Amino acid sequence: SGITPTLQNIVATVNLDCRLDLKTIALHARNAEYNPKRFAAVIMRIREPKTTALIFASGKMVVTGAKSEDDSKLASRKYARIIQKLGFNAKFTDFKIQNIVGSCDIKFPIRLEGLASKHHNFSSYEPELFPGLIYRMIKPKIVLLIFVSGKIVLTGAKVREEIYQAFEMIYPVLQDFR
Amino acid sequence: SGITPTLQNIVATVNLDCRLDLKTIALHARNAEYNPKRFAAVIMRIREPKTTALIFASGKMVVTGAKSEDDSKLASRKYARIIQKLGFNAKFTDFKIQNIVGSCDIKFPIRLEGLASKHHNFSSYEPELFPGLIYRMIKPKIVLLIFVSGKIVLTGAKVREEIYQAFEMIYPVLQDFR
Amino acid sequence: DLERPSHYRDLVTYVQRVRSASQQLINLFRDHGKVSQGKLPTLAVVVQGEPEAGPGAFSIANAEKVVNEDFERLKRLMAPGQRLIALPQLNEAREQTVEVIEEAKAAKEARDARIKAAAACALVAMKVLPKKPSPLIKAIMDSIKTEENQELQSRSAATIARLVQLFTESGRRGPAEKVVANLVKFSCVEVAETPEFPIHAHKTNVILSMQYAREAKAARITRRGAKEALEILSKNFGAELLERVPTLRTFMEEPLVRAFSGDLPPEARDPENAFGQEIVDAMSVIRTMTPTLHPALHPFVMQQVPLVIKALRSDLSVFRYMAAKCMATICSVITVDGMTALVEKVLPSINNPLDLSFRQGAIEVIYHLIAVMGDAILPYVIFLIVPVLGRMSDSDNQ
Amino acid sequence: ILSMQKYAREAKAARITRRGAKEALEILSKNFGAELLERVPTLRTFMEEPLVRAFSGDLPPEARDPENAFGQEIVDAMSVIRTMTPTLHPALHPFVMQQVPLVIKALRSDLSVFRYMAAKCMATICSVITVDGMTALVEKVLPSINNPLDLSFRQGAIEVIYHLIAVMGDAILPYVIFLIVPVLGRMSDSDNQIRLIATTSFATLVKLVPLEAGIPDPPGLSEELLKGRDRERTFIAQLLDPKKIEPFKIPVAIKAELRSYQQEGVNWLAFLNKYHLHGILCDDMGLGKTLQTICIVASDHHQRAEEFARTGAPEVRKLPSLIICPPTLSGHWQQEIKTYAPFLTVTAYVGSPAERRAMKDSLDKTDIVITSYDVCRNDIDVIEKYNWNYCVLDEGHLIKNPKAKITLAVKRLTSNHRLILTGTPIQNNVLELWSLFDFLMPGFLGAEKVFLDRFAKPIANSRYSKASSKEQEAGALAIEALHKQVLPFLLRRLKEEVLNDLPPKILQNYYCDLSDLQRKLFEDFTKRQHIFQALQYMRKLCNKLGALRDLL
DNA sequence: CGGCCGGGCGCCCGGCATGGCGGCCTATAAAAGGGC
DNA sequence: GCCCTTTTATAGGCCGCCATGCCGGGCGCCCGGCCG
DNA sequence: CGGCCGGGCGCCCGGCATGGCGGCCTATAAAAGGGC
DNA sequence: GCCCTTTTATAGGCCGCCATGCCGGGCGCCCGGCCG
């Protein structure tokens, strides 16, 4: 079993249940940028907890960058408050975490070629294109990028226990190859 | 294919076709030793080609130590002559080589454990008892002793081509394991 | 004093991990290896340290026994030929088991050391001075070396700073001098603050300023702890530090009065002579300690500046490196005197054509002086500007 | 002594390349004959430029730099002399003869590789240019073998002997007379590797010593070499003949009078002094070992000091002498030195643990230094860093147990001469004698296991015997061998032989039988832990009062 | 034997403009939500 | 394709640069000679 | 403040004789022929 | 088991050694005090 993963990113979606005039948000908030040619949302930011919000005209927003579930929820609530202050009748509704990313560093290098050869059905490896082995796991639906340095990053999770289970499942395989 | 074995010992048997009084051989020849308690033969030696002969009372002898077939045959003929000079009516008959030993040194170490694991049907390895891996080959009937240093000694052959064939057969296996 | 407990309830997770790995070794690889039932009695289900765990609970000792004695026994019990098939996976499992055992033992050692350090801090706090101070100093210094937690390391630093003062007042000085020597030793362990002489013994007329992952953290945490200890010691002793403790003086000074008047042992250039490392270890302490000394010791460093400047003019590259660092610090803190020394007896030497060492040291001193002083260097840029302008077009590349 | 200290692929390439180059150079020299030193200068530069460089005391700091190529170029240059000299023409023998003064200094240098290469090259030169090279050796190498402080001098001058023997082989017969005494002395030298190679050289040389009395003189020997052979003959003649000279003394006006047995003792000490052998003056107490010891020490110091005025070599340096006594005898030693040898100067490193720093550097400035066993023990880590001329232990028996820390301390004292004063060199076990001789002459009686098997086990097994050849003969042979081995290095003289007024001593045992109560207690104890408690209880219950009452 | 000898050839000059190594720089890879 | 966040990290192609020349024209050097 | 203080304890002494590391030394392995 | 020849080579057990003691008995050192 051994060491535990450290979460690095959490993505949450929350519906404010009201239409927003994006340019009015951009012109009033210092911490907002709007470029309709590049992207259809205003990119707001706050410094506690450090997070970014893609707030769309339809009332949905995507809050990213948090390191914990409580931080993500609190940041989403703060963004809803900020939209409320600008005059819109935004209401915090429909919160749901939709991605968690983790990272871990087991203390030994990995023989990626042998791992790819043995577990070819569940992995892909093109070292000319990307220096990391890609591993897709069916039971917890987690995708792991495995690197020769002994560092693994897990993605696609919707709960912390999913990345924990994925690391527990993958650790014996990495032990076998050095 | 690569390098070629070097022959190290050839054992030949020749029948002199006449009874011999061993103690009379010992008492007259300087180069003969006789110890009936230890062994039943007189151990004669000559210095060209360097060989030893176990000469028995029944008329048989075993000539050992030769590095080539011609040298072995010539040494056997010389020993027959020496027995003739001591008065016995010995005659050179029934020459037949019965063992050839070879040695070779491929230039890489060998992973003995993996070789033993894969080829368990034709090998034995007890590193607590003997550092060399034993290998028994069915087709040419040659027994090879493999060492981690990259040195192989072949034995049991009755012709040079047998050790050559055995080395050709075994070389790919040793290439596979480092 | 008394031996520590064999286990702690916090490490039941580690022991359970060891139990699972050992069970894997016993069971799965003998099913693979075709050894009949009765190979070994089952491991104790309850691990040591848990509540309601019997005296025969699974322990690390059982893990060692199975990974050595039962491993040999089971190997001998395997049928011939099948042993050849099975053994490599058995070796892999055995090595994994040994790794988990080592992890558990290391965790136990860390917890024991932390508890001992806290107890020692408590004992020194209430002013206990044992007649036979064998284990107390050991625990405290272990918590200065291998303490990843900054707060407990600072507490142990204060503990040593008070212990030295109490022993000085008591009059006994053996252990006091021993711990002062050990502190000065640990302060110089970090490579980035004092390099390993055996590596740089072969480099001449090169600017050092222009030129395993696990150990990098250990060195810097140990140096952090030692430096905090030395700082608190100096703040405690105030003006009298140069009187109370002389062992620090010998460490700092013996290679400085040595090598004077052009003196140079041939072994100073020997990679296998320890004094080549001891010189730089000595000269690091001046930089490490001078900013936190009392102003009453500013005359001491001022009187030693004639040694540091000559070290800066010396043909030894590490001498010039350390002299540049120390002169930068001294001019930072003893400002007027150090800058007088610099402008009057370093900058004149910057233009020497033949003495490449003079120019090299006298430019590296400026580099480090700017880097350390920052905004404070404003009144002296008028002194520093012309040498740098001239040396931008110098023959030497670095 | 560095002579004592994919790769397999390169090892063959190196030697085949060196074989080819050496054959090429040999044929080139034979082609050119006498004129090779004229026609080809680049060879001369390669051979010679690091030889005139680094001479006259010269030493670049980069010569000690691992990353400087010249540190390799020096030895690469010095190899060519050995590689080429035996095949040169005799017309170039003057060239190598003129360069011998450079190679001898290369042998005296503090650089180890310099000494290695110089030993090799001098061995070759003495092989081929025999008379001149051996004149240089006997006149300007062997005198330096005895220098106490110059460790490099002794090391190079013993390695040159090693290689000279190894290369010359049978040709060294007329010259063994010069080399026998240095190796004999250096077998007992303070330094380990000098002792080892001197042991090998002596194993080679002693077999040839019986022939040296009659080897025909080589035809070309210089007058200095004939004089050297004659004086070495007279030197050795006293060692290998029971005849002996009148003892060595310095007849100072204030010098004390010597008794007859003291005269014999100083004679024995002088005999040891000449040939650099060490002994134990294991006389009975009350015969005045102090007078003999200070006499020989003062005579040696006087002789060296006088010789330092007739010469300028670093052989003499007015080195200190050390004496280690129990604390009670320091006053007696100082009084005897002052009253019998005034011109000596004395120092007492007996102060308090802080006081000793007041005379830390005075150790190197006074003729005689006195110290205690325990003061030396606690401060050995600083006393080891000094060299001494004489190292005297006043009570040897203190250092009989090898595991005791005092022995480990005292055996680190690097001294030119080394002597133990005692009364009981062997008290309980012969391993005490082994421990003493390990300090005096290391390696002389072998390692611990060697001495054990040779002597100690038979000696212990001889404790219970009834004239049975199974164990009596073993013990008898062990004592005879140990007697012969250590005979010349002990000088026991009984108090009965010296003192003209000491009445005889008579001994009687008083026998009695144990009392009833104690007898019953012991008989009960037979039924009744540790082994030692039984012996202690037997000692206690053994407690005679009527016997003492009647005896008084 | 000393001193001036010719004597060869390696070095540098200069043009335009083509082909073969370059370093460096995204793009590569993974999840996901939203809208365009 | 387009964008936001996050830890991981390195090797193919694309745009450049860069030494390639090769005929006369000259200078300077050392490398072979000989001359009275 | 200088100088003698007691004061503790580490070091060494010595016995017999038991148990736990030792280095070193065959024996290990392979073919085969002969005779005892 | 017994022997002859040959190239390969290293790690278990067996016979030893070797430091273990532990009660009084002493010496010497430094490490704590104080005394007029």
First to last CA, chain A: 16
**What's the per-residue H, E or C state across D422-453?**
ECCCCCCCHHHHHHHHHHHCCCCCCCHHHHHH
**C-alpha D338, offset from chain centre:** 29
Query: Is the Cβ atom of B130 within 7 Å of strand G at any atom?
Result: yes
The H or E element containing residue B136 is strand B133-136
Chain B within 8 Å of C32 (Cβ-Cβ)? no
**Is A1–C17 a contact, with Cβ atoms under 8 angstroms apart?**
yes
Inter-residue contact D226 to D34 (CB < 8 Å):
no
Chain position carrying tokens 């490579």: C191
C-alpha span between C335 and C301 (Å, rounded): 12
Q: Are strands D346-349 and D368-372 parallel, antiparallel or unpaired?
A: parallel
C-alpha span between C84 and B123 (Å, rounded): 9
- Going by C-alpha positions, the residue among D318, D319, D315, D273 that lies closest to residue D296 is D273
Resolution expressed in Å? 2.8
In this complex, the nucleotide whose C1' atom is nearest to the CA atom of residue B102 is H7
**Is B117–C85 a contact, with Cβ atoms under 8 angstroms apart?**
yes
Q: Residues spanned by CATH 3.40.50.300 within chain D?
A: 260-486
Inter-residue contact B134 to B125 (CB < 8 Å):
yes
- Write phi, then psi, for C42 (nearest 5 degrees): -65, 145
Q: How far is the CA of B30 from the C1' of G34 (A)?
A: 23
Q: Which chain A residues are Cβ-neighbours of C92 within 8 angstroms?
A: 176
Interface with chain C: mutation pick from A1, A118, A168, A171, highest number of C CBs within 10 Å:
A1
Question: A155 forms bridges with which residues in the sheet?
Answer: A143
The amino acid occupying position C359 is: R
- DSSP 8-class letter at C68: I
Q: Which pair of tokens denotes residue D160?
A: 């040159």
Inter-residue contact C333 to C234 (CB < 8 Å):
no
Angle at CA C233, nearest 5°, toward C231 and C237? 120
Q: Which chain A residues are Cβ-neighbours of C23 within 8 angstroms?
A: none
- Nucleotides of chain E in contact with protein CB (under 7 A) are 28-36
**Is A175–C103 a contact, with Cβ atoms under 8 angstroms apart?**
no
Q: Which of residues 5-44 of B touch strand G (CB under 7 A)?
A: 9, 11, 13, 39-41
Chain B within 8 Å of C84 (Cβ-Cβ)? yes
Chain D within 8 Å of C271 (Cβ-Cβ)? yes
- DSSP 8-class letter at D87: G
Which residues touch C42 (CB under 8 Å, ≥6 apart)?
Answer: none
Per CATH, the number for D260-486 is 3.40.50.300
First to last CA, chain D: 68
Inter-residue contact C94 to C135 (CB < 8 Å):
no
Q: Number of CB pairs < 8 Å for B and C?
A: 17
Q: Which pair of tokens denotes residue C383?
A: 């002194």
C-alpha span between C373 and C328 (Å, rounded): 8
Binding residues of D for ADP: 257, 262, 289-290
- Nucleotides of chain G in contact with protein CB (under 7 A) are 9, 11-17, 28-36
Binding residues of D for Mg(2+): 394-395
- Closest approach of chain C CAs to the CA of A155, in angstroms? 26
In this complex, the nucleotide whose C1' atom is nearest to the CA atom of residue D376 is H29
The amino acid occupying position B133 is: L
Residue among B113, B114, B120 minimizing CB distance to C81: B120
Experimental method reported for this structure:
cryo-EM
In this complex, the nucleotide whose C1' atom is nearest to the CA atom of residue A39 is F3
C-alpha span between C164 and A19 (Å, rounded): 71
Is the N-terminal amide bond of B109 cis, ω within 30° of 0?
no
Q: Quick one: CA torsion of D514, D517, D519, D522, rounded to 10 degrees?
A: -130
Chain B within 8 Å of C80 (Cβ-Cβ)? yes
Sheet containing A50-55: give its strands across: A32-34, A42-47, A50-55, A60-66, A6-15, A93-105, A151-157, A143-147, A132-136, A123-124
Nearest Cα residue in chain D from C202 = D67
C-alpha span between B78 and B87 (Å, rounded): 15
Q: How far is the CA of B142 from the C1' of G30 (A)?
A: 10
Nearest Cα residue in chain C from D66 = C202
C-alpha span between C160 and D358 (Å, rounded): 32
Inter-residue contact A64 to A71 (CB < 8 Å):
no
C-alpha span between D296 and D267 (Å, rounded): 9
C-alpha span between C30 and C40 (Å, rounded): 10
- Going by C-alpha positions, the residue among C168, C196, C185 that lies closest to residue C229 is C185
Inter-residue contact C142 to C135 (CB < 8 Å):
no
C-alpha span between C135 and C127 (Å, rounded): 16
Which residue's CA lies closest to nucleotide F1 at its C1' atom?
A38
Which residues touch D161 (CB under 8 Å, ≥6 apart)?
Answer: D179, D182, D183, D201
C-alpha span between D362 and D7 (Å, rounded): 53
Question: A132 forms bridges with which residues in the sheet?
Answer: A147
**What's the per-residue H, E or C state across C88-136?**
HHHHHHHHHHHHHHHHHHHHHHHHHHHHHHHHHHHHHHCCCCCCCCCHH
C-alpha span between D239 and D485 (Å, rounded): 16
C-alpha span between D131 and D174 (Å, rounded): 11
**Is D66–C201 a contact, with Cβ atoms under 8 angstroms apart?**
yes
User: Chains near A, with 3+ CB pairs < 8 A?
Assistant: C
The H or E element containing residue B52 is strand B50-55
Q: Which chain A residues are Cβ-neighbours of C20 within 8 angstroms?
A: 1
Q: Which of residues 113-172 of A touch strand E (CB under 7 A)?
A: 124, 126, 129-130, 132, 134, 136, 141, 143, 145, 155-156
C-alpha span between A37 and B27 (Å, rounded): 116
The number of beta carbons lying within 10 Å of the beta carbon of residue C326 is 28
Residues 94 to 123 of D: which have CB under 8 A from any C CB? 110
The number of beta carbons lying within 10 Å of the beta carbon of residue D549 is 8
CATH architecture of D1-240: 3-Layer(aba) Sandwich (3.40)
Q: How far is the CA of B145 from the C1' of G31 (A)?
A: 11
**C-alpha D243, offset from chain centre:** 25
Inter-residue contact A149 to A109 (CB < 8 Å):
yes
Q: How far is the CA of D334 from the C1' of H36 (A)?
A: 34
Inter-residue contact D113 to D72 (CB < 8 Å):
no
3-state helix, strand, coil in chain A (%, to 5): 30, 35, 35
Inter-residue contact A170 to A137 (CB < 8 Å):
yes
- Going by C-alpha positions, the residue among C240, C233, C137, C230 that lies closest to residue C188 is C230
Residue among C202, C266, C270 minimizing CB distance to D67: C202
Q: How far is the CA of D46 from the C1' of E11 (A)?
A: 32
In this complex, the nucleotide whose C1' atom is nearest to the CA atom of residue A66 is F5
Q: How far is the CA of A106 from the C1' of F5 (A)?
A: 24
The amino acid occupying position B23 is: K
Domain range for residue C324? Answer: 150-398
- Closest approach of chain C CAs to the CA of B169, in angstroms? 22
The amino acid occupying position D371 is: T
First to last CA, chain C: 57
In this complex, the nucleotide whose C1' atom is nearest to the CA atom of residue D402 is G12
Question: B13 forms bridges with which residues in the sheet?
Answer: B62, B96
- DSSP 8-class letter at B121: G
Chain C within 8 Å of D57 (Cβ-Cβ)? no
- Nucleotides of chain H in contact with protein CB (under 7 A) are 2-12, 17-19, 21-23, 27-32
